[PDB]
Amino acid sequence: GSHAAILWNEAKAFIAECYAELGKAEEVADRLDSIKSEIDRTGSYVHTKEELEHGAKMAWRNSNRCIGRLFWNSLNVIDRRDVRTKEDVRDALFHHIETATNNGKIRPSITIFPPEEKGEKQVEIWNHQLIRYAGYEGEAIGDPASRSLTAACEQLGWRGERTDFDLLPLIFRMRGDEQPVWYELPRSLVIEVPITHPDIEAFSDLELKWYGVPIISDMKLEVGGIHYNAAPFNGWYMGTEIGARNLADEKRYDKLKKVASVIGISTNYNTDLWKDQALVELNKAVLYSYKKQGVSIVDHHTAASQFKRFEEQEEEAGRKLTGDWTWLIPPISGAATHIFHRSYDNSIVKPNYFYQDKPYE
Amino acid sequence: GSHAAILWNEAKAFIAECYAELGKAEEVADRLDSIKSEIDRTGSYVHTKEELEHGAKMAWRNSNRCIGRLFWNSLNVIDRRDVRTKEDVRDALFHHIETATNNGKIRPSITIFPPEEKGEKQVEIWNHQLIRYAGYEGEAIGDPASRSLTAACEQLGWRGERTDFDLLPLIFRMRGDEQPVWYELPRSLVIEVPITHPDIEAFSDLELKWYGVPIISDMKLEVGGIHYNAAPFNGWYMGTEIGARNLADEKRYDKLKKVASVIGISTNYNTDLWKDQALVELNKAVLYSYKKQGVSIVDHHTAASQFKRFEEQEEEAGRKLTGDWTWLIPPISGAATHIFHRSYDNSIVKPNYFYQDKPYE
Ligand code: HEM
Ligand code: HEM
DSSP states (O other): OOHHHHHHHHHHHHHHHHHHHHTOGGGHHHHHHHHHHHHHHTSSOOOOHHHHHHHHHHHHHTOTTOTTGGGGGGOEEEEOTTOOSHHHHHHHHHHHHHHHHGGGSOOOEEEEOOOOSSSOOSEEEOOSBSSOBOEETTTTEEOGGGHHHHHHHHTTTOOOOOOTTOBOOEEEEETTOSSOEEEOOOGGGOOEEEOOOSSOGGGGGGOOEEESOOEEOSOEEEETTEEESOOOEEOOEEHHIIIIIITTOTTTTOOHHHHHHHTTOOOSOGGGTHHHHHHHHHHHHHHHHHHHTTOOEEOHHHHHHHHHHHHHHHHHTTOOOBOOHHHHSOSSSGGGSTTTTSOOBOOOOSSEEEOOOOSOO | OOHHHHHHHHHHHHHHHHHHHHTOGGGHHHHHHHHHHHHHHTSSOOOOHHHHHHHHHHHHHTOTTOTTGGGGGGOEEEEOTTOOSHHHHHHHHHHHHHHHHGGGSOOOEEEEOOOOSSSOOSEEEOOSBSSOBOEETTTTEEOGGGHHHHHHHHTTTOOOOOOTTOBOOEEEEETTOSSOEEEOOOGGGOOEEEOOOSSOGGGGGGOOEEESOOEEOSOEEEETTEEESOOOEEOOEEHHIIIIIITTOTTTTOOHHHHHHHTTOOOSOGGGTHHHHHHHHHHHHHHHHHHHTTOOEEOHHHHHHHHHHHHHHHHHTTOOOBOOHHHHSOSSSGGGSTTTTSOOBOOOOSSEEEOOOOSOO
16 A cells, blocks of 8 residues: 555656666656556566666665765676575575675675565575674684674574684575575685785784675665665775774774784883874785785775765766765774865665664574 | 843753752752842843853863863863953963963863853954964965964954964954954963974974964853853863874875875875874874973873763763764774764753854954
């Protein structure tokens, strides 16, 4: 009743906006008629390859928290709405990792899986990211952010070796099944980068490493009223995400004090700004390491500079710019970028990516 | 008509809340009667020494953008509502600098001047801060943030030597005068700190320096409906304000590239994170310098730690905590403090400090 009404309204808004950008303004009338009859006949409608391809791009462009939006139109859209089995999904996820990694020269990609029909999911991905480390407790081992998902995986037959860098398996659920299935990731498919410093040799004593490609797999892609709960996407890392957050947060790997030790500075006084010096060196190490192994990465300055060019292009295209200041500013030297010195409208514009409730926990 | 109504409403709210914290709950009834008769007789009311003293403190406690709120109850309130002449104001401002500086051991203080009567100001301070550097243009000289006020001062007979660190004079306007008066600051009253590094001797080649005490003199203190447009206040600096903003912003002194040069690093590649390393060293220098000359300063870690204790005390006192995340997080290593990892309610609670339109510009 009310669900068939919201769907039609969001479809009219999307097709108009989408076709206007694609230069197919005359085809709007004939397409909306087909959609109206499709919603009445089945209860939903199917996007064309061109529609969801641009839809996923528009969704990226409207992502307020993303600093890499300059490259929105170069997104590699992989259409996998034809998957029916768990092997199909697995192979699609494996393919995503392979094609996105591209031997280091990372390609911003997204794999589209079947959307929700009558509110029920067809494929449901449990992983936050396709490649992520596990986490445990007695004393902290691994990535604390992954604790709940690690426990869920263990309740399904999976067991990790309990090192700080255990690769969580792929874990997803198919329509009609009560519990999800899991598949260990083939190591040959996963690129990892050991962290070393360009001037400090002792840095390798920390035995730090991180994976090459972040692939967010738990967000919902909303395009024209259609909910693609399963649609993993990826870009390349921005150094700070690793050296200022993942390896620095007290609630994550908490490595600042150990970094200070290998670089030769004391952790006695705050006034010595040891945490800051540790952050700079750890972040330099991250950037040097990724570049050395031939894996794409971008520093926060270059990234902000690229985002500045994005702001200019949106003004040039006549589109309103939206952004979340609190997420756009880098966690290291934010005042050194232009983002800090201006304000952004945090309005939500569709199509976009949204958060969804975690099946575990 | 409507002005006498708003005033009475804000007075009832303030006296109740103020006396409840002071343990004088029974005196509320008799005090509100006197106030009601005072508003009818004159059109406004006069605070008691105890009322505005605690009012200024409560105002500090409600300042969402302030990280040093832990020390709210130790505020040194100086009552100068008895000033009538321009010499009175000048001496009060001179006194403020002297007593607040306290030979380096800075004392958080506030000088209260007469409030607005029928919407018109009695004393109007033009300075953003009592002690601040001037700014000019052909090529950039001094502090760009002070350009407009510097031009206004020059249109009044004042002329600076055009160095990067010229002290702007005190400039204020008395009721009944069309234009403001100005007084040069006595150098013996102003403590300045030359910036040097603990390990790098070449740092002094940058010839950087900053003043010791920041005294915001252009904000409005609102207590119980009474508007104290002139009420300068001060705390001590947090290193980052100087080394990550005042001396780092491209729109301020823009010293990062010159800092990189004296510390021995290249400014060629962003991936080398030279801006970040420059920021750490400049900030360490700031903290070491202030401490060396015996002038109070606090690093961002200690400051966040102190703010954490403030959050706990407000929960313990039963008061709702308000804060602006975007201003509370430090501009250097924000994720290394607890502030970054939580959210804050940006609701405005009175009494508080507000922005007011600049008479110049
Ligand atoms: C191409 C390079 C990319 C860079 C450098 C970049 C960078 C960033 C950064 C630094 C954040 C903050 C992450 C954090 O602090 O947790 C972010 C968030 C985000 N970005 Fe990207 N991004 C890229 C590509 C993409 C792509 C391919 C999409 C989608 C098609 C996208 C969607 C978003 C979304 C929705 C968020 C918020 C996610 C969250 O709330 O956890 N980004 N991005
Ligand atoms: C005692 C030590 C103090 C410290 C360490 C401290 C620190 C800070 C910091 C770091 C900011 C940000 C400044 C910027 O980024 O421009 C701030 C803003 C502010 N603080 Fe403080 N503060 C202190 C005392 C005070 C006192 C004495 C009051 C008032 C009685 C106060 C009122 C505020 C207000 C209203 C703002 C916002 C001002 C603006 O928007 O420009 N603070 N504080």
